[PDB]
Curated annotation (Swiss-Prot):
Higher expression in adult small intestine and to a much lesser extent in fetal kidney. Forms a beta-barrel structure that accommodates hydrophobic ligands in its interior. Keywords: Cytoplasm, Retinol-binding, Transport, Vitamin A. One of its GO terms (biological process) is vitamin A metabolic process. It comes from Homo sapiens (Human). This is Retinol-binding protein 2. Its main location: cytoplasm. GO terms for molecular function: fatty acid binding; molecular carrier activity; retinal binding; retinoid binding; retinol binding. It is found in: Cytoplasm. The lineage of its organism: Eukaryota, Metazoa, Chordata, Craniata, Vertebrata.
Length: 133
């Protein structure tokens, strides 16, 4: 479907550490991030999204409009400037983040009550699955 609204609880996360290493997140921090439970809340109104991924001390938020490139500064992650763009490819929500890292971005597949999220950087893919609470 295209309706990603909801509160999404993590069911699985594969290759998180490889993806974080490809972004250059500090090794010591990685070993903390791997322990943290993540909650993903998405508010979607037309083209307008507000995405909030939260854990006890570490969050990632992004707000965007589909089809509108935006300057993103990943201040809580690797602290880089990218030019980000989120588009629909059929029912897949696709983000490409142009900048230093190649093949950087993410894709969301919504399948009923499930959300599949693939985060890419370089040659690494992290595959996550969430279920709608
Ligand atoms: C559509 C959903 C998206 C783009 C979710 C993105 C979430 C992240 C990039 C979360 C990253 C985090 C870490 C790399 C370390 C631990 C803290 C998190 C979960 C906020």
């Amino acid at each position: 479907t295209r309706d990603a609204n909801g509160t999404w609880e993590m069911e699985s996360n594969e290759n998180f550490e490889g993806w974080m290493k490809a972004l250059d997140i500090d090794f010591a921090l990685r070993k903390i991030a791997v322990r943290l439970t993540q909650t993903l809340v998405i508010d979607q109104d037309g083209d307008n999204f507000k995405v909030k991924c939260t854990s006890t001390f570490w969050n990632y938020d992004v707000d965007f409009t589909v089809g509108v490139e935006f300057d993103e500064y990943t201040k809580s992650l690797d602290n880089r400037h990218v030019k980000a763009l989120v588009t629909w490819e059929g029912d897949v929500l696709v983000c490409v983040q142009k900048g230093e890292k190649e093949n950087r971005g993410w894709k969301k597949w919504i399948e009923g009550d499930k959300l599949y999220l693939e985060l890419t950087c370089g040659d690494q893919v992290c595959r996550q699955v969430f279920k709608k609470k």
